[PDB]
């Protein structure tokens, strides 16, 4: 199985280019895309080596980089121009899909704040038209900005099969808190570490989690509640890493309860004490879970790249993510009373209201029906 990545807008190209640099250095791949001498299954993200990227001014600075051998602002303006080059960009994808052995999914890296955001919304719909059996995971990044943000939300709630949220307000606070930057090329260092760590169990094979659906099938309970948040602690026993991930200071998100948790421990930790820690974390009751259906916490180990110590990443599904949509929602209404049909905004405003209504009702003892 293989996973084709797409990079849209200024953000997608930058965080994708930094994702590939980190992923090339994590492996034994020279900047000239040639394997150096110096186990890690790399057929999923690299093609025999060529990355399976589809990039869409910034391209020139990439081509002037040492990695050249590795390959307006409205939403309506970003939607229309994609329609006029509909056939163009798909030929690149159609040859890469059929040239691929057995396609699995489509990773999308884009910022929803505007030509790239508009182009993304267009492409997300067409992929549902052509390929019905391919997952679409989107590494969206949150910030007329309220308008564009909610429109793409209308597509991300019914088209994208999964979604991992990364908001700049939580990342920028971290850079000033634990990095003391006072830049885009600086916070992207953290975004690259989370992205590279997200697909760790795919490149280093283990007994479990050898496919992208294996990670997603546990967290997302119903096709509607497909939003996730992240947590990265080291900015050492396994009990220490678990307790530091469940603190609010580390999450990348600005009653409520958890639906499912996945922990990625990438160190050389002792794999015999991992089952012990899950016995004791349950006793302190550090996290509150859904009352309707059963839920648990998941811990998965891996191996760090020797060519480059314990780290940790936590993928969670918390209903407190509903607050982020509320801010965009409330920000939209204030502009709607202040200034060919303007009916698409009405439908998008309505459908996101149902998503928020699902979350607040997802925390009740009678979410069934």
């Amino acid at each position: 199985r293989e996973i084709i990545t797409l990079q849209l807008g200024q953000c997608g190209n930058q965080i994708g280019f930094e994702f590939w640099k980190q992923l090339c250095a994590e492996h034994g791949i020279s900047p000239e895309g040639i394997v150096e001498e110096f186990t890690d299954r790399k057929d999923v993200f690299f093609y025999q080596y060529i990355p399976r990227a589809v990039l869409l001014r910034v391209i020139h600075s990439i081509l002037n980089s040492p990695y050249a051998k590795l390959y307006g602002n409205n939403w309506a303006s970003g939607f229309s121009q994609g329609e006029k080059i509909h056939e163009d960009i798909f030929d690149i994808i159609d040859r890469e899909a059929d040239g691929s052995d057995s396609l699995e999914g489509f990773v999308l890296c884009h910022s929803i704040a505007g030509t790239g955001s508009g182009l993304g919304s267009y492409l997300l719909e067409r992929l549902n038209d052509r390929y019905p059996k391919k997952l679409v995971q989107t590494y969206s990044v949150f910030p007329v900005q309220p308008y564009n943000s909610l429109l793409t939300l209308k597509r991300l709630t019914q088209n994208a099969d999964c979604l991992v949220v990364l908001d700049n307000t939580a990342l920028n606070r971290i850079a000033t808190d634990r990095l003391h930057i006072q830049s885009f090329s600086q916070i992207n260092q953290l975004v690259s570490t989370i992205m590279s760590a997200s697909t760790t169990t795919l490149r280093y094979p283990g007994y479990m989690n050898n496919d992208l659906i294996g990670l997603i099938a546990s967290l997302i309970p119903t096709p509607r509640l497909h939003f996730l948040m992240t947590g990265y602690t080291p900015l050492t026993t396994v009990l220490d890493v678990m307790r530091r991930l469940l603190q609010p200071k580390n999450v990348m998100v600005s009653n409520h309860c958890y639906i499912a948790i996945l922990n990625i421990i990438q160190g050389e930790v002792d794999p015999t004490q991992v089952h012990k820690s899950l016995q004791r974390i349950r006793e302190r009751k550090l996290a509150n879970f859904i009352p309707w259906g059963p839920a648990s916490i998941q811990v998965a180990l891996s191996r760090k790249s020797p060519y480059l110590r314990v780290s940790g990443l936590m993928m969670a599904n918390h209903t407190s993510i509903s607050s982020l949509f509320e801010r965009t929602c409330r920000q939209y209404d204030k502009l709607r009373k202040r200034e060919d049909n303007f009916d698409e905004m009405d439908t998008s405003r309505e459908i996101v209201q149902q998503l928020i209504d699902e979350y607040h009702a997802a925390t009740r003892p009678d979410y069934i029906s």
Binding site: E37, F38, P306, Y307
Partner: protein, 176 residues
Amino acid sequence: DEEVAALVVDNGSGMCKAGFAGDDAPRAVFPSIVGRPRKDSYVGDEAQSKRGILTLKYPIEHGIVTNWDDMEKIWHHTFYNELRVAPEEHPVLLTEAPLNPKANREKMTQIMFETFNTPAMYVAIQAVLSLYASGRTTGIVLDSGDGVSHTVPIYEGYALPHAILRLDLAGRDLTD
């Protein structure tokens, strides 16, 4: 026989030769290399065989020991792996390059007695031993190995340091 076998260890810039005194030839010969990952330490042929996953070190590259930590590992390898003997149970005769710094001679001595607990030891100049092998105590020896060559005048068993010449041209250079 009352005496245990004495060991003879020839420390070469490229290949070490080890065996038992009295024998006509060394029992083992291996590369003077120590390797560690890019089992924690690899020495000899194994280091060479698995050089692909290791970073190699040559502690006696030009005849003179430059890294004693790895030289100690080569000697450990010599006793326990190649000869399969316990150094604390056998006297050990070691060889040294011509013009070997005095401090190095003391270091080798200290390591044999304190680290390997040898019951006895001795160190002889390589060129002198070759002259002995030819049945002579006087003559000039042209010793050309892997990483260094020397012309060593010897009179009555004693090398004449003032007349010894070193040539940084040997087998390695010829191969390249």
